[PDB]
């Protein structure tokens, strides 16, 4: 009971810290692309000039993968492996794309469709980023589930 | 392809006594079902999750089994305000939801004959075109009711909508309103409109009827 | 805290779209995650339409694919339900509601229920008809053929409520609906108190003060 | 006992989620500030082009917002409001300072000033930055002992 | 799983600073927080904290050592520094870090493996090895003297007399350099049949002397 | 600025008994207390943290008291693997600490007379410039024990470091060597030169020594 609730919360932790920083690339994807700050509306739009912006795309990308080689579970370990596989995948995409991506004057459209999961065309890397949610959020209701079986321990076996 | 059935769609307990409402599943949905209470008027409560666990801050007089595809929700000594509607869920397939039919929880009560009126249409309403001739049962219980209609004899069908009352706040009671609508061409054509209304609480079947001009 | 309110507008013409916007009070998308939308036709009971994820993923009934649609907004206060093209079994309330947590998941905060009626418009005051009586008597008032929903009605400027039935409304073929509401006085006050009821239509302003005579 | 662990864990993710968002920053000012994306190495050196990374930036900030407002706890109430106030003196002061920051040629000495809190100089709002990490990790402190006192009433 | 891994340097010239590195194994610093802290015992003295840092990269400090120590976080979050400036003698001590934090416990769970650090005046030395000559049992043995740095390793008969011997802890001479004793007990009556050597091996200086005691 | 001490600094158990440890905080540190064990050669184990409850991986027979500044780690019935030092720790302020100054916690046997050997600077030391005059006390319990040296009656003092051996893994008893040093110059001037030995287990203070050589 008390080893199955700490070791079974950790994940939980541990998986909605990666949903937390996917929601980092997501954000950044639907609000900043494109855009620059502004002293009243906050930002304001600056066309194809998204270069930096996917470099820290990216950036955080990487902090995502290292997390998920911290998450380790037996119960959870196909769902991880899976999860595993996912941002490798991504990363690798922004690697592979890297002419269109690589400089500071990024079209708004290829900056889109390789971040933001919900764009029209999804071949830079938003088709993996989505592939990549799906596994992360999959593994969620799983991780979940573990923890809250593990206190419905307080009624009922 | 899953399926799930309330076991009575209406229930009918006196206050104070032990309801038993019950949720059954074309195959199991496992350890994952959920109870819901939906007064007219409000959004639906969750009650139970997990087919036993209570949502904090709903009484202990609600309690549920489960584990499988039995399912049961108990309201031991039910009060005033628990007569509503309840809903079993299934969510197994847990973004994926399934609703059941749900099951009214009826307060009980002793046999009452209806009061019949029936009523003529209204001059006005002739002169519209059309003529409404309304028949109501009044302070009745049980609600199974069934009222059909007489021209000249001739049973008429498909041509009366009817209603019902919410079950009275004092007396526990229904009430019912059927009204047979037709013009003033059909209204005009025949002379004997009657209603019958067959209840359990009357020996045989009640009419009263009227003739269109005294 | 953990509070959902529902969206604009009802009445929306058949084969087109309605449009239902959920928005979040006191509470954001967070943890990271809140999704589904639920709903109830008359004379029918709940049934689950579709739920998102903080993502955005949808899963849908399967009956309602192709035909819905659940969004999320960025800047992430609201959550949307798009539904085309509808029917008239489409019409019904609408729920929006928080359907999980850590440990209960399925379906805990509910929206406080939106109604969206699909018809050919024609918003429509009603007409009022008097139900004239024959040891009590019974008397009422018929309204007929407005739309939409509701009106409310009060005997004697509200002085008559006991003894009172409103009966809900019905939806008869013509797509207009029409109810009756029925009072029992003592048969002696036949002649000797004056009954009038009154009709109060919201859409159109149609506030009618008519009189039943025996 | 039963509400409590499942409500105080509600507490915990909700800081948490924070602080991952404020790990976004730090992430992005520590590797890629001045950088570009590289076919092998992942990230190469691209100077003075860190405008839509800061846009990025205050993107995330302003989603830190949100996420503390959605916070609500009686015993935490002075806290989380210190925590609210500091998120909106960063924002602001990124906003405030658009001259340097809002277009596509802010300068990478700059940028650290802005959401690097461990850099050298700190004038364009990595000082508001630190006093939020600060902030809200005081935040944290209090929601790691609210969870662990409701689990350890088992024994 | 959940493991620490030490440092760097262990001999730096007083007054100087010296720099200790912990690398994480099979962990990262994450949920979103994990693994701070570093923490010193120094020689014939307990355990006393030193600092502690946050995943942000907050530090707290004992005092007594403010000013004085600094702890940073690597960015591609692998490894967390130490770094003590100046540093006099009596900062010579064994290191650990540590992870002084999960969800339900504040303190202070994952354990390094515990590193050195001297701090003295420099002039590394081979040993100077003296014998103890013995007078129904008898003693002989060995002084080591006069050598730095530590340690060094006695072995009696290359390793065939282990018996009966106490080789004792060596202690820091007010000459800043380290000297110990190696003691045996025999019995008196095999003096002049048995031949005792001991071997006296310092792995700095690569002296290796094989001193024989003979009454 | 917040004290933790541990009662008694020595404990001295028969194996299969009970232990009970103390620590007290000079103001009130809540439910906040750690136990720490630390064996010669390994990073210290976590035991208990909250102060009541035990740190997975470890015995039943480990237990802890507190609330406020009354704490104890009582270890029941504690066999040969529980013998090393216990710290305390109060944690009450987050990320800062402060351990106690520790508990070793010895085995118990009966007790031992000394067996005194006394031994010569070797002829190799008296060219080299200095003399090293060697005392050591042999197989012993308990550990206090007094050594003093006497050249030509002159009670020594400021000059001689001891060094004691680890708690002995077959009889549990202890050796000590006091090393008397002085300069070619001032070992020259004296001739009688003796290390007194008091120990519990010595019916009265025994001493040997040695003249400069034969007579
Ligand atoms: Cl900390
Ligand atoms: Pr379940
Ligand atoms: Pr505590």
Same mark, same amino acid.
């Given at each position: ?157 | ?82 007569? *509503?509607?309840?809903? =079993?869920?299934?969510? +197994?397939?847990? !973004? %994926?939801?399934?609703?059941? $039919? ?28 059309? *003529?409404?001739?309304? =028949?109501?049962?009044? +302070?009745?219980? !049980? %609600?199974?009711?069934?009222? $059909? ?66 | ?214």
């Amino acid at each position: 009971i008390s080893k199955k609730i700490t070791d079974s919360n950790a994940v939980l932790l541990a998986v909605k810290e990666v949903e937390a920083l996917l929601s980092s690339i997501d954000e950044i994807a639907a609000k900043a692309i494109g855009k620059k700050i502004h002293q009243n509306n906050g930002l304001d739009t600056e066309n194809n000039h998204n270069g930096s912006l996917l470099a820290g795309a990216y950036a955080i990308s990487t902090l995502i993968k290292q997390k998920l080689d911290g998450l380790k579970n037996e119960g959870l370990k196909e769902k991880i492996d899976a999860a595993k596989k996912c941002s490798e995948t991504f990363t690798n995409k922004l690697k592979e794309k890297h002419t269109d991506l690589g400089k500071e004057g990024v079209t708004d459209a290829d900056a889109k469709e390789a971040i933001l999961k919900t764009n029209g065309t999804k071949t830079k890397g938003a088709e993996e980023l989505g592939k990549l949610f799906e596994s992360v959020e999959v593994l969620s209701k799983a991780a979940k589930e573990m923890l809250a079986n593990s206190v419905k321990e307080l009624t009922s076996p | 392809e899953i399926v799930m059935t309330q076991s009575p769609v209406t229930l009918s307990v006196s206050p104070g006594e032990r309801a038993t409402l019950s949720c059954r599943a074309s195959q199991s949905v496992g350890n994952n079902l959920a109870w819901y209470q939906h007064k007219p008027g409000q959004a639906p409560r969750l009650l139970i999750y997990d087919a036993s666990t209570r949502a904090t801050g709903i009484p202990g007089r609600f309690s549920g089994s489960g584990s499988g595809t039995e399912f049961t929700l108990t309201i031991s000594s039910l009060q005033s305000e628990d007569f *509503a509607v309840y809903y =079993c869920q299934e969510y +197994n397939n847990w !973004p %994926r939801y399934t609703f059941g $039919q749900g099951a009214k929880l009826e307060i009980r009560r002793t046999v009452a004959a209806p009061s019949v009126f029936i009523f003529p249409p209204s001059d006005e309403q002739l002169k519209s075109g059309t *003529a409404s001739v309304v =028949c109501l049962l009044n +302070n009745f219980y !049980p %609600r199974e009711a069934k009222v $059909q209609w007489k021209v000249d004899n001739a049973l008429q069908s498909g041509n009366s909508q009817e209603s019902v009352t919410e079950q009275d706040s004092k007396d526990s009671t229904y009430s019912l309103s059927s009204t047979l609508t037709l013009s003033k061409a059909d209204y005009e054509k025949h002379k004997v409109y009657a209603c019958e209304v067959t209840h359990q609480g009357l020996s045989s079947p009640v009419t009263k009827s009227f003739n269109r001009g005294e | 805290q953990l509070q959902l309110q529902e969206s604009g507008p009802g009445l929306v013409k058949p084969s087109q779209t309605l449009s239902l916007t959920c928005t979040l009070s006191g509470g954001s998308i967070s943890s990271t995650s809140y999704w589904g939308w639920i709903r109830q036709p008359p004379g029918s009971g709940l049934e689950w339409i579709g739920s998102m994820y903080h993502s955005g993923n949808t899963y849908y009934k399967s009956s309602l694919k192709g035909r819905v649609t659940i969004s999320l907004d960025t800047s992430r206060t609201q959550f949307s339900l798009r539904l085309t093209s509808v029917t008239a079994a489409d019409t019904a309330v609408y729920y929006c509601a928080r359907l999980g947590d850590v440990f209960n998941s399925a379906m805990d905060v509910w929206g406080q229920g939106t109604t969206v009626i699909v018809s050919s418009a024609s918003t429509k005051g009603p007409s009022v008809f008097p139900l004239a009586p024959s040891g009590t008597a019974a008397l009422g008032c018929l309204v007929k053929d407005y739309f939409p929903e509701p009106v409310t009605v009060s005997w004697n400027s509200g002085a008559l409520t006991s003894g009172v039935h409103t009966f809900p409304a019905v939806l008869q073929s013509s797509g207009l609906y029409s109810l009756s509401s029925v009072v029992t006085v003592p048969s002696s006050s036949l002649g000797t108190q004056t009954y009038i009821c009154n009709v109060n239509h919201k859409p159109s302003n149609t506030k009618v003060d008519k009189r039943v005579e025996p």
